[PDB]
Amino acid sequence: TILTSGTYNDSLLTINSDYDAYLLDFPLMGDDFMLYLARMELKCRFRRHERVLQSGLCVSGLTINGARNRLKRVQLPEGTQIIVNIGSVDIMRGKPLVQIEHDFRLLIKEMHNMRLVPILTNLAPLGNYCHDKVLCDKIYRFNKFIRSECCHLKVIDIHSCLINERGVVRFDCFQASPRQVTGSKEPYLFWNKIGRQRVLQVIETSLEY
């Protein structure tokens, strides 16, 4: 609220590639999925003073609105390009698709206002939610929305590398059991070593030149 404004941890105002989640000098923004990828593959460290796990702009339980709020609480040079993977939490929390798209449209617009350039990744499939056709349909439609809404921006399809030729999720790219996370109550099925490598490869090769 107005009363409590500005009482957040001032250490959140700045990020630094020495400790925070970065990929090839691009700050990373996302939820537990990107956070975990950064922890395993990119040597990131968690912030000591926050009870919710986070590293830079990667925050456990980060929704699209969370991301919108987080960026207001960060200060980066104009023209800074940020690799974004956001929306899985919104879908897991069962937010209405129309609201998800509404929020995402506002995030993009707000980043423009802040002179921050999003490099978008679409959403990986949620491995433990395969039997939920509604949720899977939401991922499909949201990913299609990203591709159209962000037609002027770089959009990286990471969803495809985790699906087989038959259209089934590659379970050999995911861990065997779900995990509890700090920022949300829903169970997460994390990408295993093979999953992480595949996703990381897609991202890197899409930005090489």
UniProtKB/Swiss-Prot annotation:
Organizes the germ plasm and directs localization of the posterior determinant nanos. Oskar protein is required to keep nanos (nos) RNA and staufen protein at the posterior pole. Capu, spir, and stau are required for the initial localization of osk to the posterior pole. The gene is osk. Residues 28-42 are annotated as: Leucine-zipper. Begins to accumulate at the posterior pole of the oocyte from stage 8 onwards. Interacts with smaug (smg). Signal peptide: none annotated. It comes from Drosophila melanogaster (Fruit fly). This is Maternal effect protein oskar. It is found in: Endosome.
